[PDB]
Ligand binder design. Structure first.
Ligand SMILES: [Cl-]
Ligand SMILES: [Cl-]
Ligand SMILES: [Cl-]
Ligand SMILES: [Cl-]
Ligand SMILES: [Cl-]
Ligand SMILES: [Cl-]
Ligand SMILES: [Cl-]
Ligand SMILES: [Cl-]
Ligand SMILES: [Cl-]
Lengths: 171, 170
């Protein structure tokens, strides 16, 4: 039950000029920039409201028409707050015309080699929320740093409570 | 099941206390004044663990007084989010003579007099007030935005073709 994501190019934050063309399938993205500009980028995003708990990864069918390697990265947002980016060092899988290999996320990016024409596998455990360190397929329980009990004694001058045991149950 | 280590640090507000660690649990003795309405004893332990595999908080406690006590929970995640009892949530207090489902009143749990049983609290009854995020809620549950950034090579004219972007179930 693969879920195909709608590719809309109405929302773009960039510092380049480009020509986007829809074809039978997918879309061609042409950019004109310079070697000097080391801040160059073309961020393309969408606004949604979907539940993705039944999926475990991104499958990006991309093709590079240049001999030089490209670079791409992902960013997901949950609860209009938590932003998830590629976890540095995490393994991603690139399947080309004849070879499939593992490459680690470097400087927050995925290297797309020259003439690459294939698909890219990025598991959701590869996207993380920096601040919380919570990976996209987990929850806040994944990184508990403190637990405590607040006690508000009765109007009696001296109160005593006995705590025999505290544990965490799981179905 | 994971038996939490009963080792604490404490904050005292308008009261003094003693924490003795006996073989039959930890005894908490407080000395305070009926007039000091800001009385409050916070006992906690800082750690670095993963409780994803768990779903509930088991607390067996005994109240030595005839007057009710009030307890609250505070679980913190590295991002400095503190989760507390959700207002209107349900908690189960199983005593010897009385057993029932209880409600969170003013963010606290009423511990009846001479109570001597167990209190069950599900992690979905813990929430961060400002974010309004439940402690066991998965991130994938509510996705509001997703994006892809393209960083071109040094070549002046770059062309990348994206035929398809999907989510695979596993
Ligand atoms: Cl979409
Ligand atoms: Cl949507
Ligand atoms: Cl290839
Ligand atoms: Cl290359
Ligand atoms: Cl002791
Ligand atoms: Cl501690
Ligand atoms: Cl009881
Ligand atoms: Cl509260
Ligand atoms: Cl809060």
């Amino acid at each position: 039950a693969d879920k195909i994501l709608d590719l809309s190019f109405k929302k773009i934050e960039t510092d380049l000029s480009s020509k986007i063309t829809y074809e039978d399938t997918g879309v061609k993205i042409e950019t004109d920039s310079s070697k000097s500009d080391k801040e160059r980028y073309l961020y393309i995003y969408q606004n949604i409201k979907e539940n993705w708990s039944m999926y475990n990864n991104f499958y990006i069918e991309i093709q590079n028409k240049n001999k030089s390697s490209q670079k791409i990265n992902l960013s997901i947002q949950s609860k209009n707050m938590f932003e998830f980016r590629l976890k540095e060092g995490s393994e991603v899988f690139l399947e080309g015309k004849n070879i499939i290999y593992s490459d680690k996320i470097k400087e927050g990016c995925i290297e797309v080699p020259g003439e690459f024409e294939g698909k890219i596998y990025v598991n959701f455990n590869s996207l993380i929320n920096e601040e919380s360190n919570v990976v996209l397929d987990s929850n806040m329980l994944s990184n508990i740093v403190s637990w405590g009990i607040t006690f508000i004694p009765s109007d009696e001058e001296h109160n005593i409570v006995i705590i025999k045991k505290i544990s965490l149950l799981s179905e």
